[PDB]
């Protein structure tokens with residue numbers, strides 16, 4: 007028997023319903039989401055990391071001159087410094103005073119740290135949505151399975167086939183372009199490959215951590231070696247990756263709305279409480295019992311003994327009843343005013359049972375569907391004492407949930423009084439018009 | 448020197464322009480696309496192939512009974528057929544006449560062909576656009592390199608830095624879902640994983656060709672073995688993959704608009720003639736020669752000796768000139784009226800030179816630039832004789848290209864006469880109105 | 889069998905079984921004489937631009953009719969307004985020039 011409904015996209019809050027199959031006693035159904043994961047499709051654009059300046063040995067040509075050549079090394083620099091007279095431990099390296107020449111070379115390569123300490127630039131596209139669902143129905147214990155929130159792919163959970171509709175909202179916290187560093191995700195609009203600027207995020211870019219084609223854009227300028235010193239001095243703009251580390255700011259993990267939690271393997275946003283999720287579950291035929299085989303309850307009287315509209319199950323109610331066969335009986339409340347804690351109760355031939363509920367309304371009024379029957383519960387709820395709590399609200403607040411009986415009384419008095427006064431004026435005008443008519447006739 | 452312009456997204460048709468750097472003689476620039484590749488990003492959803500039905504040896508329990516148990520096999524079927532009396536080569540297998548049961552088992556597997564003969568279902572998202580660009584300028588021979596058509600990534604082609612702007616049209620021939628089989632691509636809204644119907648494309652779905660979790664949805668039903676025969680008969684819906692291979696229809700390779708050519712490694716659409724492509728090329732400063740160092744051309748006179756508005760270079764023109772410092776001088780037509788075949792000519796102190804051009808105009812009138820000078824070419828062009836040609840048009844046809852001088856004359860006579868008729872009527876009306884006014888006064 | 893495909897200036901590609909695809913483009917070789925008499929000009933442009941030529945000719949004829957009707961209406965109204973002052977005055981000079989400009 008297929009049961010279809012729409013449950014809120016909330017994690018840890020169970021969806022409760024009674025599966026009513028014609029001719030069979032209702033079967034209690036409880037569906038709870040353990041986690042929800044938005045897993046977008048990502049394409050690695052390039053990898054950024056701190057550069058290393060590789061400086062090969064300078065060529066010191068005594069009593070002569072040399073010419074630099076072009077090489078494919080990233081950001082390759084080569085300059086010929088004439089008139090060098092280097093000295094070493096052995097003394098003067100060259101004979102000629104001004105006719106000797108030093109050639110200096112320098113190029114940029116990925117540092118060793120780039121193997122581990124690097125940022126991945128990703129392009130993010132709409133992907134897939136998956137969730138872990140915990141389901142119990144009737145006398146079947148809790149069962150769970152990982153499902154795809156497509157609305158078409160079925161999943162077998164304890165002999166029950168579950169189909170979960172797509173999320174009502176296509177919202178995702180990831181932007182079109184994101185940068186993943188360590189465990190953090192940043193909605194950073196990184197520059198395209200080959201356009202990174204010196205001292206900025208993209209100064210060094212590599213398609214992969216092992217790619218042989220490295221793009222490096224730093225103002226690497228070879229300086230003239232100091233008088234009598236054989237060395238290859240150079241000036242370079244500090245790495246833009248380290249500067250980014252200092253100025254990267256707040257990651258998406260700390261600013262994503264709806265309380266999304268960000269994970270990297272695979273990149274995904276978890277527990278985003280956005281919109282609602284349609285559900286369709288087929289309860290196996292064996293789970294249903296014929297109505298004539300279950301208890302029949304009558305003379306149900308519901309008394310609210312205490313109520314507080316706290317986030318927890320602050321409401322307590324007592325239902326007096328009489329029932330045949332003294333069997334088990336599911337309990338449910340189809341109205342959204344109150345959520346019932348208990349799933350079922352044990353009934354005797356006569357007596358009463360208590361159940362707990364959570365409601366936001368100051369004057370709750372809800373129908374309690376005692377198996378095959380129903381009782382209306384009404385009462386007055388006091389305000390909760392705790393200002394702050396560490397658990398989410400178990401109930402749903404409505405527009406009129408806070409309107410008290412006195413507030414309705416005043417609203418009715420103001421609306422009715424103004425309306426009646428207007429009607430009085432209109433009636434008096436019409437009556438006087440008739441009086442004048444009779445004056446002429 | 449940076450030269451910026453917009454070239455049409457055409458393959459095999461070269462773009463020609465003159466790079467005019469103030470103070471230097473024009474440098475002829477020619478940019479030709481060798482191929483254009485739209486490479487979308489794809490995610491493999493599942494692999495479909497012909498299924499194989501594996502049927503283990505039936506359990507023939509003599510003088511007793513057995514019970515089937517569930518197993519984690521795709522489309523697993525198990526049924527106990529009681530009252531069998533099988534016979535083997537050696538005679539009656541069982542002793543009891545009817546107290547014997549044959550337990551038949553069957554399940555679906557991927558066939559051996561699935562390693563080679565299978566269809567891949569992909570999700571297609573916007574990816575990247577790449578092109579192979581062939582460039583020549585001045586005296587530098589043709590050079591080419593792969594570039595990214597994104598307007599950001601620069602490419603070094605023969606010491607020239609080329610930046611190719613994004614395509615003006617974001618059109619792509621692939622839908623959000625495609626099926627790749629062999630070398631052919633099909634736009635097919637394949638069923639979601641786990642939803643394929645028996646005898647349909649998705650009857651067999653596997654996340655990858657080597658996965659150990661296979662989805663199979665076939666009406667595999669075990670039939671009762673024939674009397675006295677040990678065998679496991681079964682009925683099953685014929686493979687929906689074989690059916691699909693019959694009814695695939697036209698592939699995207701044969702229906703993609705704009706002449707796109709579909710390739711699979713990587714999946715891409717090549718040579719799609721959509722929109723235009725902005726370009727920016729930085730020509731080396733060494734390619735430019737000062738004005739005073741190049742020949743001066745004067746007294747230009749252009750005579751069209753033959754012309755037909757064919758798709759080939761049907762036009763022929765002769766230009767008389769006077770000059771000095773005999774040498775090479777580039778030739779270019781800045782307007783779209785005519786496309787010049789030759790890129791440069793050798794000029795003597797005096798004489799004439801000829802060039803070929805392609806034009807769609809019946810009365811072409813275009814400016815010809817001869818390095819530091821320019822001349823206006825005018826003439827009449829005859830209709831082409833060939834009804835069909837095997838090459839694309841070099842020129843571009845404009846709204847007024849087909850309007851002949853005679854057609855313009857008739858349009859002028861029409862508009863002038865019609866307007867004169869209305870104007871004369873209005874003038875006569877005004878004159879008579881003034882006469883009547885003077886009559887009263 | 890014989891199959892006929894329409895080829896325009898944009899081109900057409902056809903693939904005969906197991907042969908490489910072939911591309912062909914149609915040139916503007918339509919029949920007619922754009923430099924001849926009006927019937928030859930109309931024939932040329934009709935063959936090159938059938939629908940555009942039909943619309944153009946219909947628009948020209950409509951414009952001619954509307955303009956000629958307006959011109960004749962204005963001229964006849966001018967004659968009526970110019971001559972009426974003299975019809976109501978039989979004993980008038982009625983200069984000969986009046987019969988030449990307003991008629």
Ligand SMILES: *[C@@H]1O[C@H](CO)[C@@H](O)[C@H](O)[C@H]1NC(C)=O
Nearest residue numbers: 040138139140141148149150
């Ligand atoms: C399902 O719910 C039961 C009881 O609430 C719990 O013990 C079990 O761990 C839950 N399943 C998962 C996967 O969390």
Ligand SMILES: *[C@@H]1O[C@H](CO)[C@@H](O)[C@H](O)[C@H]1NC(C)=O
Nearest residue numbers: 479481579581582589590591
């Ligand atoms: C570039 O064009 C020239 C002349 O058309 C040709 O020789 C060369 O092969 C072309 N380059 C490529 C990569 O085809």
Ligand SMILES: *[C@@H]1O[C@H](CO)[C@@H](O)[C@H](O)[C@H]1NC(C)=O
Nearest residue numbers: 834889890891892893894895
């Ligand atoms: C194709 O055109 C020719 C005339 O050019 C005609 O004879 C033939 O019947 C046509 N065939 C079809 C199928 O239209």
